[PDB]
Structure formats: structure tokens, C-alpha cells
Design a protein around this ligand. Structure first.
Ligand SMILES: [Ca+2]
Length: 279
């Protein structure tokens, strides 16, 4: 399948080169997989989701995304225009209030929630979780990421927006999950991407067009926008049969486009997520 005049990041993770605007992908498009967006929620009523999104948890007084962040990230995963994995089932978990603030302990509660709940969902092709959030190093936050991953969920986490080595941030520094940095449409590491040997992979994160609340669409920027490209990609690769929840971060690195970003500080991977469909 081909989707012309696509947001640049969907074209990128289907291209070897920058500078084009069609998104090339096998039409399976994540059918039979499940992605949990653990964030401010998801405006499931957005027609871009076509009936495939359900809030399933909150730790606040409403499950609604009253911020828009969770809805944008979720759209990149799996909205019909703006998503990677255009036939995946999306499940929301509201661990952030509406300003974007979550206490750690609640973040943790969300995460163990997914390891349990996946068993209440129909996900024959595989489960993913997408965490576009974080704060300072915590062993506990990190440990809740290793549990979620160990429970057979592909876990994808934002490396962070401080232009700093990510080993000091959580859940990014955790080893066993898939820590995502960011790039721009000219293949520059994004000026705000954390870096450091804990990163596994980079994704489009600067001027990412996606859904917003009210039914609407905006472009914003962050390792948060990069993260759901890798989550959605992993859902896409499960469904096909290329990899598994426990093998997908390795698998994406193995198949990445290798050398191609500017400004990988020394010691940071220079691997860019790629679906290997067109070549
Ligand atoms: Ca890893």
C-alpha cells in the first residue's frame, strides 16, 4: 500500500533517503495487534481512530484527554491518516493529568496495569506499549518498565528533551526496553534529543503532524512524537510475522538505516527506524 503526501515521518520510516512524502507499507497495517498509549488519554471519538480506540484506565477523576498529548501520540501509532499501524487496536491509559503531570507512583501503577490487562484483550499478533513521558532516574520507575517488558510487551520509551545523556532519566535509562530519540526531516539528531549509549533507535520527532482533541490535527515536536513511530512500527512488524514483542527492539535495530543522522554524538547509535517495505 501507498499513502501519497503523508506526514514526513511516516515517509521517512519507509524510505532509505529523506526528502519524500509517500508512506509505503504492507496493507496488514497492524491488524490483530494491540498498542497501549500510556499518557494523558485518547480522544477515542476522533473519527481518525475509526472505532479502534478505547480508554480502558485512568488514575484521575475522568479518563478524557483534556491535554491533547496522548491523542497526538496515539494518532501516530494508529490513526487512519497519520498513523503507522493504521489497523491496530489502541488502548488508553491516562497516568498524566491534563497539564501533562504525573506522579511516579501512578505512572508505575499504569505500567503494571498493562502487564495485567493485556490478558483482558484480544491481541493475537502482539502487544506494545508506547510511553511518551519520563522524569529523573528512578529505580522503581525503571523496574516497572522491565516488568512490563518481561510480561511480553514490546515497551517503547522516549529518551527525553533536554539535550542530555538519557542514562539520568526514567524510564529511558532502563536497559531492557526500547529507548527512542528523535530526528528531523533533514536527518539531523532533533535539537532537544537526549542521547547516550542507553538509546536503541531513533524516530521522526521534529514537526510531527498528528491528531488533537476536538477533532482536530497539529504538529508538535519531541522524543514523545518519535516514540509512537517505533511503537506503531513494532505493531506493524508483529503482525506480519517478522518479530515478536521480546525480539522487536533488536529486530528494528538490525533492520534500521545505519549512518545516516547528523550529530551522533560519539557513542550514541546512528540507527534510524525503517520498515524495509520498498527496498
Ligand atoms: Ca533494548
Amino acid at each position: 500500500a501507498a499513502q501519497t503526501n503523508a506526514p514526513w515521518g511516516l515517509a521517512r520510516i519507509s524510505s532509505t533517503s529523506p526528502g519524500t512524502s509517500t508512506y509505503y507499507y504492507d496493507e496488514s497495517a497492524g491488524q490483530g495487534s494491540c498498542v497501549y498509549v500510556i499518557d494523558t488519554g485518547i480522544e477515542a471519538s476522533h473519527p481518525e481512530f475509526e472505532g479502534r480506540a478505547q480508554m480502558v484506565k485512568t488514575y484521575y477523576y475522568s479518563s478524557r484527554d483534556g491535554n491533547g498529548h496522548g491523542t497526538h501520540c496515539a494518532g501516530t501509532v494508529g490513526s487512519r491518516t497519520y498513523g503507522v499501524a493504521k489497523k491496530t487496536q489502541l488502548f488508553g491509559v491516562k497516568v498524566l493529568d491534563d497539564n501533562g503531570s504525573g506522579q511516579y507512583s501512578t505512572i508505575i501503577a499504569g505500567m503494571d496495569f498493562v502487564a495485567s490487562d493485556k490478558n483482558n484483550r484480544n491481541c493475537p499478533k502482539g502487544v506494545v506499549a508506547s510511553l511518551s513521558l519520563g522524569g529523573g532516574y528512578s529505580s522503581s520507575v525503571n523496574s516497572a518498565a522491565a516488568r512490563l517488558q518481561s510480561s511480553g510487551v514490546m515497551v517503547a520509551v522516549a529518551a527525553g528533551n533536554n539535550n542530555a545523556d538519557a542514562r539520568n532519566y526514567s524510564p529511558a535509562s532502563e536497559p531492557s526496553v526500547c529507548t527512542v530519540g528523535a530526528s528531523d526531516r533533514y536527518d539531523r539528531r532533533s535539537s532537544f534529543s537526549n542521547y547516550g549509549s542507553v538509546l536503541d533507535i531513533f524516530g521522526p520527532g521534529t514537526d510531527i503532524l498528528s491528531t488533537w482533541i476536538g477533532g482536530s490535527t497539529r504538529s508538535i515536536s519531541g522524543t514523545s512524537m518519535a516514540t509512537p513511530h517505533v511503537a506503531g512500527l513494532a505493531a506493524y512488524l508483529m503482525t506480519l510475522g517478522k518479530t515478536t514483542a521480546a525480539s522487536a527492539c533488536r529486530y528494528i535495530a538490525d533492520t534500521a538505516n545505519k549512518g545516516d543522522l547528523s550529530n551522533i554524538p560519539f557513542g550514541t547509535v546512528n540507527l534510524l527506524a525503517y520498515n524495509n517495505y520498498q527496498a
